[PDB]
Design a protein around this ligand. Structure first.
Ligand SMILES: COc1cc(OC)c(Cl)c(-n2c(-c3ccccc3)cc(=O)c(C)c2-c2ccc(F)cc2)c1
Ligand SMILES: Nc1nc2c(ncn2[C@@H]2O[C@H](COP(=O)(O)OP(=O)(O)OP(=O)(O)O)[C@@H](O)[C@H]2O)c(=O)[nH]1
Ligand SMILES: COc1cc2c(c(OC)c1OC)-c1ccc(OC)c(=O)cc1[C@@H](NC(C)=O)CC2
Ligand SMILES: Nc1nc2c(ncn2[C@@H]2O[C@H](COP(=O)(O)OP(=O)(O)O)[C@@H](O)[C@H]2O)c(=O)[nH]1
Ligand SMILES: [Ca+2]
Ligand SMILES: [Ca+2]
Ligand SMILES: [Ca+2]
Ligand SMILES: [Ca+2]
Ligand SMILES: [Mg+2]
Ligand SMILES: [Mg+2]
Lengths: 418, 440
């Protein structure tokens, strides 16, 4: 009875979240109508974490769909699992955000934010013991970034003692389709650094490379990329959704993954013999964030293996990776690599592994955005679009300072010794 | 509803509007009488094509457009033309006497008689909108109506609608294509009066479209119909994102935010590819990467200038048709490797992209061949300052001797407005030089 309230905002948030509900609905064996037609009772032991039990034994996700542009709502509602969701949980506007963070955070999103919190109060009050919230959104746009972080700030006011998770698609180093994304990303990161307990960094360029270089898709699409992200989201939340040797929640994950409150930005991975999975799983080629783990040290790591597989074999292989490449792990957090196993594998797979790393190498990402942010901000390029919504330049300078301070923090523990 | 109201001012704007709304009807399957068989949402709906068309209970799809001209000859043809019943009589506004190539007559003398009426009809269209997004204003620089009345309208729209988006489509004069001696004066006066009220202006050098039509389409001696049909392809590409549903399209706000780095620097350079005849399109297909490369060849720009000698500040690439993301990303990846295409150092990420899978449409009669993938690029480049310089020079030659100025003073203007408008242009030219200078 540790329920999670899911929220998805913006195109990216809704497209990624919609595919996420498709994935776990299959894992819990729930059809688009919301009725269970599975085989094992282990699919239901912890189903109330992500679903409400409705009259007629229909299952309804604790999902809240948000955007300032109604177009993406209609796509969700007409998608494979469109009619699963609660009609009243579609909270949308008509104006859109125009890739403008200020519109999403201060004007257009501020008009709609209360309506979203009202839907949150419904869901949260209908929870035996509310555990926390999870958000899926992009940082480069205006709604998921600007309004997304506004929703986070408001939720922390009502629920200051609850856990806030996010799955944030970050700007990629070379692939971009938004000219002002450095402004939007830097403004969002300064919000995420303060009002989130855990943030999974997702990079579309890395996801595209996997789809193209590895999976051999000659014409990858956002559907293919979303499938990879959804597969990772299911893998991360496997322990929250299924029983097993591990009985842990989101707060325990944060307590053990975050040695310092601001450094809570994780590097996700996914794979694909047991030895070969652990080899893949730690590979740069399998990392969902555009940062080389070899360019830093892991503060903490979490690995989840799924499917019938030799436990002792995994333990030996994991322990080998730690001891073999121990120079990439901080020496002052003893036993900072923990592993969990679940008997239920995903669809069309016999074995799978999900990776969650709190690596100091993630500062490379915040370096990039800072340098891109400064190049535009020095010349106040495109700024009038933000000051026109009522922002002041000082709010831009503060975000620049904070993300540089965050970058400064990461470098501190990347060279710390015992 | 994200509606957009089109305003077509003067002969050029009206005649350009004739080609655009003809194309729109062909792209949406709307018949000359306004009936749209494929539309089952009779009397209304939230469809994407309702941003430009309103519905009536009788199944009539009516353009959200106003046509204004100070003389009736041009709009009279619309009232008796093939799309005569597409529009409503109230939407086709005309006076009896034109501005006579005089900005002052269009702005001060003949314009005042009709401006209050025009705003009322625009008001009537606005009241029918649930979420009006902005205005599209089609006009020439050279004509007295297109220059003088448009300026008047833009100022009045800012008072009655505040900061609501206002985008222009402006015809930059050229000696090849039926220009007049005083058109440099009108262009400078209207640009200065409209600079502070327009959020994004799309100039089209009439010499550039004359050349493209004469070279790419092998039309020895282009007509206004040949030019307007080409212009409508660019207008269609820019508004396709608004008239059609899609997951990868660029709405106006998204469109303006990623293309205008500073309020005054809002004159993107438009290109379209492929512009090709049927004879050449026979047994010939061009790919995504090919049309992407053509967008950066100065020979295809809608305004004559040399991007190679300037710097890019933002590029918007609107693909349409049989275009897949993988090809788009590869084609743009190549452009970023080309050191021949220089971006300002304060634009680390300078590409906005979109795809509209609806295929390009050709007027049955329009020299363009029907292709399957097309791209319209809109780039904010310093090179566009070259067009300002050419026009500013022609202004200086005449104004040094005060040639023709008496025609404007007779209508109530002062020579001070001429120099003020010229100084604003001088600041703009210096502005384009400043933004192109490398950072410290
Ligand atoms: C993030 O900025 C982008 C820039 C870009 O071209 C410069 C593209 Cl094609 C995409 N993009 C699009 C798309 C987006 C906006 C307009 C049109 C198409 C759709 C799509 O399904 C996929 C997979 C991608 C994509 C993602 C990550 C990559 F590494 C490579 C391609 C994204
Ligand atoms: N592309 C294009 N340009 C046009 C067209 N008609 C006129 N022009 C341009 O417009 C200029 C002449 O001004 P007009 O727009 O025709 O004059 P007006 O707006 O009707 O104002 P008046 O002075 O009162 O006649 C010329 O320099 C032409 O280059 C047209 O149909 N297509
Ligand atoms: C009465 O009908 C005429 C009216 C005009 C013109 C003209 O001579 C071609 C006429 O024939 C008699 C004309 C005058 C010459 C101009 O420059 C000297 C000009 O730019 C202006 C032109 C005409 N405009 C154009 C594009 O030819 C408009 C004025
Ligand atoms: N994975 C994924 N990323 C997306 C998708 N759509 C947009 N993005 C990312 O988000 C950015 C655009 O922001 P957008 O999603 O439109 O944000 P919004 O304005 O809040 O809706 C791009 O740079 C992409 O990297 C999608 O369908 N899938
Ligand atoms: Ca409002
Ligand atoms: Ca309330
Ligand atoms: Ca309709
Ligand atoms: Ca109808
Ligand atoms: Mg006329
Ligand atoms: Mg978009």
């Amino acid at each position: 009875m540790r329920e999670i309230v899911h929220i998805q905002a913006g195109q990216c948030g809704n497209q990624i979240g919609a595919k996420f509900w498709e994935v776990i609905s299959d894992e819990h064996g729930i059809d688009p109508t919301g009725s269970y037609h599975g085989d094992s009772d282990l699919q239901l032991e912890r189903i109330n974490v992500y679903y409400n039990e409705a009259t007629g034994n229909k299952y309804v996700p604790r999902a809240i769909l948000v955007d300032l542009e109604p177009g993406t709502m209609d796509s969700v509602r007409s998608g494979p699992f469109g009619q699963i969701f609660r009609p009243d949980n579609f909270v949308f506007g008509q104006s859109g955000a125009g890739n403008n963070w200020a519109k999403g955070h201060y004007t257009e999103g501020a008009e709609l934010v209360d309506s979203v919190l009202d839907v949150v109060r419904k869901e949260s009050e209908s929870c035996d013991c509310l555990q926390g919230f999870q958000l899926t959104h992009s940082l480069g746009g205006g709604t998921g970034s600007g309004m997304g972080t506004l929703l986070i700030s408001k939720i922390r006011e009502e629920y200051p003692d609850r856990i806030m998770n996010t799955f944030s698609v970050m700007p990629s180093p070379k692939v971009s389709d938004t000219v002002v994304e450095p402004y939007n990303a830097t403004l969002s990161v300064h919000q995420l650094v303060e009002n989130t307990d855990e943030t999974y960094c997702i990079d579309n360029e890395a996801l595209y490379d996997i789809c193209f270089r590895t999976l051999k898709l000659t014409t990858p699409t956002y559907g293919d990329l979303n499938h990879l992200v959804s597969a990772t989201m299911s893998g991360v939340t496997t322990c929250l959704r299924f029983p097993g040797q591990l009985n842990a929640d989101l707060r325990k994950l944060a307590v053990n993954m975050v040695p310092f409150p601001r450094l809570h930005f994780f590097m996700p991975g996914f794979a694909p013999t047991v030895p070969e999975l652990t080899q893949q799983m730690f590979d740069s080629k399998n990392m969902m964030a555009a940062c080389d783990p070899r360019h830093g040290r892991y503060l903490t790591v979490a690995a989840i293996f799924r499917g019938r597989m030799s436990m002792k074999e995994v333990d030996e292989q994991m322990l080998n990776v730690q001891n073999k490449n121990s120079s990439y792990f901080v020496e002052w957090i003893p036993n900072n690599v923990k592993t969990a196993v679940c008997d239920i594998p995903p669809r069309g797979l016999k074995m799978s592994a999900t990776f969650i790393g709190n690596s100091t190498a993630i500062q490379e990402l915040f370096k990039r955005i800072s340098e891109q942010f400064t190049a535009m901000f020095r010349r106040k390029a495109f700024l009038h679009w933000y000051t026109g919504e009522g922002m002041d330049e000082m709010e831009f300078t503060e975000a620049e300072s904070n993300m540089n301070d965050l970058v400064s923090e990461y470098q501190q523990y990347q060279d710390a010794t015992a | 509803m994200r509606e957009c109201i089109s305003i077509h001012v003067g002969q050029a704007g009206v005649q350009i509007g004739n080609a655009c709304w003809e194309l729109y009807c062909l792209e949406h399957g709307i018949q000359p009488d306004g009936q749209m068989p494929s539309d089952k949402t009779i009397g209304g709906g939230d469809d994407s094509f309702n941003t430009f068309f309103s519905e009536t209970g009788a199944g009539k799809h009516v353009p959200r457009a106003v046509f204004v001209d100070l003389e009736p000859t041009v709009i009279d043809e619309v009232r008796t033309g093939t799309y005569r019943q597409l529009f409503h009589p109230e939407q086709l506004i005309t006076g009896k006497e034109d501005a006579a190539n005089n900005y002052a007559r269009g702005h001060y003398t003949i314009g005042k008689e009709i401006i209050d009426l025009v705003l009322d009809r625009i008001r009537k269209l606005a009241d029918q909108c649930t979420g009006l997004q902005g205005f599209l204003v089609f006009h020439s620089f050279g004509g007295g109506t297109g220059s003088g009345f448009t300026s008047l309208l833009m100022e009045r729209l800012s008072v009655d609608y505040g900061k609501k988006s206002k985008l222009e489509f402006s015809i930059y004069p050229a000696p090849q294509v039926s220009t007049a001696v005083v058109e440099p004066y009108n262009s400078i006066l209207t640009t200065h009066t409209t600079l502070e009220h327009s959020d994004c202006a799309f100039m089209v050098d009439n010499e550039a479209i004359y050349d493209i039509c004469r070279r790419n389409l092998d039309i020895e001696r282009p007509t206004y119909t040949n030019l307007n049909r080409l212009i409508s392809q660019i207008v269609s590409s820019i508004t396709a994102s608004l008239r059609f549903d899609g997951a990868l399209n660029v709405d106006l706000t998204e469109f303006q935010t990623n293309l205008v780095p500073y309020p005054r620097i809002h004159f993107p350079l438009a290109t379209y590819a492929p512009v090709i005849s049927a004879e050449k399109a026979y047994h010939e297909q061009l790919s995504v990467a090919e049309i992407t490369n053509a967008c950066f060849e100065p020979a295809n720009q809608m305004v004559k200038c040399d991007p190679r000698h300037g710097k890019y500040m933002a590029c918007c690439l609107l693909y349409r048709g049989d275009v897949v993301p993988k090809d788009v990303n590869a084609a743009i990846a190549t452009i970023k490797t080309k050191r021949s295409i220089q971006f300002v150092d304060w634009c680390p990420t300078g590409f906005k992209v979109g795809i509209n899978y609806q295929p390009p449409t050709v007027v049955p009669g329009g020299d363009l061949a029907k292709v399957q993938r097309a791209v319209c690029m809109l780039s904010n480049t310093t090179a566009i300052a070259e067009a300002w310089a050419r026009l500013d020079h022609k202004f200086d030659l005449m104004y040094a001797k005060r040639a023709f100025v008496h025609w404007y003073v007779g209508e109530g203007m002062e020579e001070g407005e001429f120099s003020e408008a010229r100084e604003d242009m001088a600041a703009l030219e210096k502005d384009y030089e400043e933004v192109g200078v490398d950072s410290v």
